Structure formats: C-alpha cells, structure tokens
Ligand binder design. Structure first.
Ligand SMILES: Nc1ccn([C@H]2C[C@H](O)[C@@H](COP(=O)(O)O)O2)c(=O)n1
Length: 269
C-alpha cells in the first residue's frame, strides 16, 4: 500500500542520517590513530541488529523491501565502523572487539539461521525471527537508558545532545507508522518503546540543560575583614573546595583562607 511506501522512504532517509551519525567520531579516530575511549559495542550491536532485521524481512518478502534497503546499507556502514575501529584499536581492545564479533555476529547469527531454516518455516518462522528481532532491538535500549541515568545523576545533558534524541524520535514514529501500514507489530512495538524513550530524552534535555549555574555567572564574594576575594572559578582547592564551587555551596565551617574569619563575614562583590 501507498502509506507503507511513504513511511518506508521516510524511514530510510532518517535512518540513513542516523547511520551517518558516528562519522565525525571516526574522522577523529582516524586523526589520532587511536580509538581513544570509544567502545565497539554500539557498532557490533547495530550490525547484528541490522542483520537480524534483513533476515526477518526476507521472510515477509514483497512488502518489506524498504526495511531491507536501509538495513542493507546499515550492514555496510556499520561494517565500515567496525573495520576502522579494529584498525586503530589497542591490541587488547582489538582482540576484545574481534571476539565479540565472532561470537555475536558470526556464530550467534549462524546459530540463529541454523535454528530457523531447520526448525521452522512460514508463519512459525516469522514469529520466531520477529520475536528475536524485537528482543534484541529492545535490549539495545540499554545504552540510551544508561545515558538518561547519567544525565539525571549528573544534572547535565552533555552526553545527550538534543538532535540525536529528536532524530531518534522521528525515526521511531516513522518506522512505527510503517509497521502499522504493513500491519506488522514486530516492527511497530519496539518503535513505540523507542519513540517513548526519545520523547523522554527531549523532555530531560529541556529540564536539565541549564540546571547547573555557569561558573561565569557565579558571584564573587569578599571578606570584609581581610579584603580577600573568593573566585568560584578558582575556588579554594588547598582547603577542600574544588574550583567551580559556588559560594553558597561552600560548607558553613569554611573560613577566609588568609584572615581565618567565618563565612558570615563575606559579602558579594
Ligand atoms: N524496532 C525496530 C528497530 C530498528 N529497525 C530498523 C529500522 C532502521 O532502518 C534501523 C534503525 O537504524 P538507526 O537507528 O541507527 O538509524 O533498524 C526497525 O525496523 N524496528
């Protein structure tokens, strides 16, 4: 049907973009000739997921062509990210990555093919594969949930840029509507989860972006006995007050580092 086509094209465009999201990261990694502190799990994952979904679609044949084309392109692009990463990786990390690549992507996937080609056909095949795709896709939500957890725990949104959230959300509702059009609730349900979590991400961003007060706008205070000036940007490290500390967040048993008088003797500049 026409609808499924519109949402297929849309889904492909948006998801294409999201597949090109790690590119600056890899421009970096190619610069430094090191994978730095980056992990290969998102990539090994994204590839395994893409493969599972291609496999799922080949069972649905005709309608689901559009959820192959994107996943197909996934397989390539992720395969690229994996190669580069393994090129510029630590020996230790190189081997970690290769091991997970052999377990999940080669063996795991092969076992899945083996179990599906010889234990199911037809509808039972659809249900098995679908169940597995839903399961894995859902499991991949651990990374964004982790990110959310960090954002709330840290009251910052540095690790969670707004546009990634937006694009993930739009991707989610697009493939949701897509699943609805081909009446496939294996494609649709985890996109419900995804759209929900994305919305919650945008909400968290709007809430926590300007939570902490910028060190710049923090107020200087002065000891009216010493003349001493407290710089929040400088803080008072030698006496257990890390730089960037606000004056009001300083423990009330703190004193003027020069004069030695109480905090009550201080007044804003
Ligand atoms: N519940 C899901 C999860 C994923 N995908 C497919 C659609 C996208 O083509 C790809 C997601 O790619 P990405 O988010 O990286 O852009 O996975 C899907 O059809 N249904």
């Amino acid at each position: 049907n026409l609808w499924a086509f519109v949402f297929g094209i849309l889904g492909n465009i948006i998801s294409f973009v999201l597949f090109l999201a790690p590119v600056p990261t890899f421009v970096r990694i190619c610069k430094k000739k090191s994978t730095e502190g980056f992990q290969s799990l998102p990539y090994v994952s994204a590839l395994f997921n893409a493969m599972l979904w291609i496999y799922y679609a080949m069972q649905k044949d005709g309608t689901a062509f559009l959820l192959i084309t994107i996943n197909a392109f996934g397989c390539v692009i992720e395969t690229i990210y994996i190669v580069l990463f393994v090129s510029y990786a630590n020996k230790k990390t190189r081997i970690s990555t290769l091991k997970v690549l052999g377990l999940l992507n080669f063996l795991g996937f092969a076992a899945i093919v083996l179990v599906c080609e010889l234990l199911t056909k037809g509808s039972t095949r659809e249900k098995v594969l679908g169940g597995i795709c839903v399961g894995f896709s859902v499991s991949m939500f651990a990374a964004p949930l982790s990110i959310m957890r960090v954002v709330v725990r840290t009251r910052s949104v540095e690790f969670m840029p707004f546009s990634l959230s937006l694009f993930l959300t739009i991707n989610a509702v697009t493939w949701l509507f897509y699943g609805l059009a081909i009446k496939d609730f294996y494609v649709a349900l985890p996109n419900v989860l995804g759209a929900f979590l994305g919305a919650v991400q945008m909400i968290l961003y709007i809430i926590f972006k300007y939570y902490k007060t910028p060190v710049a706008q923090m107020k200087k205070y002065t000891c009216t006995v010493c003349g001493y000036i407290y710089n929040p940007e400088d803080g008072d490290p030698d006496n257990g007050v890390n730089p960037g500390t606000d004056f009001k967040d300083i423990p009330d048993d703190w004193v003027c580092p020069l004069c030695g008088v109480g905090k009550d003797q201080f007044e804003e500049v």
